[PDB]
A and B are shown apart, each in its own frame.
Chain A
């Protein structure tokens, strides 16, 4: 019963291992194993539940263990292991074959098979940790191992894609440990974690690997947002070390999502508005990306309110996420209607929900935007309006208070009007007829560059699938 269970999953694990084993030996095929490793994460997660944990026990016995002797015992000690044929050397799948990692040449140390075996061994260990949700000592014990090993081992172009997915598990398992319980040893692990990301990023710069460097950047930018220090992130994004070539579909929208949050407190909404829009188009529409689309669309609606312009409220309805978008509808309604008491009572009840996404701090500053939008609505209606007519509609304090607030709207060129103190009315200075200026040419010059930018993208992509088929023989 239990004997046939261990041989079934181990044969499928070697079958998938031999596919990427022979491809990395000749030249560089690494593009092909990268596609296989994408599905390997999903196929292994479903397979870990079946046949219990015994699929990874005989896999270490098959190959040679450089560091992994005590790692499997320590990983299986917390679950109160039940020992069945636990003596090492029970299952031998090698039997002296070239693709089987021939033993005599391996035991005599005349050849080194540890490079591809050990780096792949750490991948299967991190998968069971996230599947079984093993925390506390098991998280810190594996961190003391992989990091010193990556410093001694020098990865080639194909080998840099192995640990690229391991850095995500180190940061993911660390954040779940801090939020679960607060202990004195929690931040001691984060200090070394923050210093380790900067040391390995220095080496990956010369490797020119797209997935390796881009995976760390999105993990480093998230750490800066938790501490709330832009000075570390400001110079970090100015170097432009983020590879734009191949992020696949995972890192497309993750990079632009951080720039929208950083520039939100920079008081520049021109560039931040484009980053949040590009994050929506680059993010997949599937169910696994719904967690990202939930937080991203909530940030886009908050940026528009900070710009002074009322966005489209139809997104709060036709979308299927409106259950979580209900608190944000009353915020825009209070800013549009200009009611002072409605905005104060709206943020009071939903303050608990705004604490999770940390958007309540931006909602406090929406108190000013209620007046910013209210002035824009009343100004467009009446070109010449009396000074006391504004205080009657918005129920303001006095005439000296509104005189200061209207002067704040034309600061950046929003309203573009003038205040006449002696005449007693505010007159709009916008005569339209802007076509006589150079403004139409300013937009058309970018459309030509944007059209040729899409041309330059299509300019050079054809031959990539044609390299394999034209070089190989065809019927």
Chain B
């Protein structure tokens, strides 16, 4: 269900082109004639409002925005009951006869597991996890448990529900912790970091994506280079510049990945320009980054403007370490900013204690604040040193 999830994701916010939502809408109507996508489109209008929420024919009666092409016509309306008879009335009667004839054990479990995948395309989630629970008691080895954790993971992928799905994803590994091969051991930890990207835990969850996407891909939902853009942007985002030379710019998979398609423009254009300390050509590569990468990708657009605040402070911080004092004519008259427009970027970063820099408003001499031998031994020691008696007397003064 990645095709309808990735392409129709442009229905959230697209400020670039109008045909982006139109071209992606063709894949929605093409894939829905085979398998039922109806519960996916119903949630699109129930998530974001006053943008695309008025395009549904029957939810409430509304017409708005630019898109008349996403809807259920009189054909799919009559096909709504046709798919329900095949996915419920037809399948449940065949499995019910298996319990009466008592044929096999794991074969009956795989029947409920395969049937449980149809409930994801139905839109009733109470019977989705119920059928998986019936096959849970019939599951013996780890072969039948592979598709169980995949169907449960689709509940948060297909319905975009990060609340009730993460409880079931953790319940499988917590009740019985085995993992089998290290391939699945990374799968239980991958789904853990997916729901943490919705709450935006930053480098905690995002550090596992660059490791998993550079080794193995499920290959069933998508391809290797389609979701590779998630690890390309978060690669330089989470990892410091010191380790970018031994990891990102030199990699067996990444250097062969840029030759597959030009839609990345991260591990190549942004990495080489950042390692060369040249910000003249580095910034125009960011112009095609957010547009052609962050917006179309799902988990990347969940952040969007959350990337730059961490990245914009870091790109200048690395330049301040290479010189004691810089010049305003280098920043204002050359690369990324003008004179007056510089106050908007570094103006809000310093009061947040993100970086320490000094700009001269007369002679135009940029000055860098260097802690020298102070560092965390003196100043930062006082800050985090007060937490010793703060956390001790918090619950300690009340005894029991």
Contact = CB atoms under 8 A, between A and B. Distances in A.
A75 interface: no
A434 B374 CA distance: 9
Interface in B364-400: 367, 371, 374, 378-379, 382, 388-389, 392-398
A435 B381 CA distance: 11
B101 interface: no
Interface stretch (B184-192, B315-323, B343-351): B343-351
B167 to A, nearest CB: 19
Contacts of A2: none
Given A381-B350, A381-B351, A450 B362 contact: no
Interface string A275-296: 0000001100000000000000
Interface string B176-187: 000000000000
Q: Identify whether the interface residues of A are mostly helix, strand, loop, or mixed.
A: helix
Nearest to A278: B397
A382 B358 contact: yes
A381 B348 CA distance: 8
Contact of A377 (B351, B378, B388): B351
A383 B397 contact: no
Interface bracket on A: 20 to 34
Given A381-B350, A382-B359, A393-B343, A447 B389 contact: yes
B353 to A, nearest CB: 9
Interface string A378-405: 1011111110010001000000000000
A440 B378 contact: yes
A281 B394 CA distance: 6
What is the interface of chain B mostly: helix, strand, loop, or mixed?
helix
Given A281-B397, A440-B378, A443-B382, A384 B343 contact: no
B374 A433 contact: yes
A83 B117 CA distance: 72
Contact of B358 (A281, A376, A383, A447): A383
Contacts of A376: 351
A389 B361 contact: yes
A385 B379 contact: no
Contact of A384 (B351, B360, B379, B392): B360
Contacts of A432: 371, 374, 379
A218 B263 CA distance: 69
A435 B396 CA distance: 32
Nearest to A440: B378
Contacts of A433: 374
Contacts of A386: 361-362
Given A435-B374, A435-B378, A443-B382, A384 B389 contact: no
A427 to B, nearest CB: 11
Interface of A: 249, 281-282, 376-378, 380-386, 389, 393, 424-425, 432-435, 440, 443, 447, 450-451, 454
28 contacts: A281-B395, A377-B351, A380-B350, A381-B346, A381-B350, A381-B359, A382-B359, A382-B361, A384-B358, A384-B360, A384-B361, A384-B362, A385-B361, A386-B361, A393-B347, A424-B362, A425-B362, A432-B371, A432-B374, A432-B379, A433-B374, A435-B379, A440-B378, A440-B382, A447-B388, A447-B389, A451-B389, A454-B392
The 5 A-B pairs at the shortest CB distance, nearest first, are namely: A435-B378, A377-B351, A381-B350, A383-B358, A386-B361
Given A376-B351, A381-B347, A386-B362, 6 more contacts: A281-B395, A281-B398, A382-B358, A385-B361, A432-B374, A443-B382
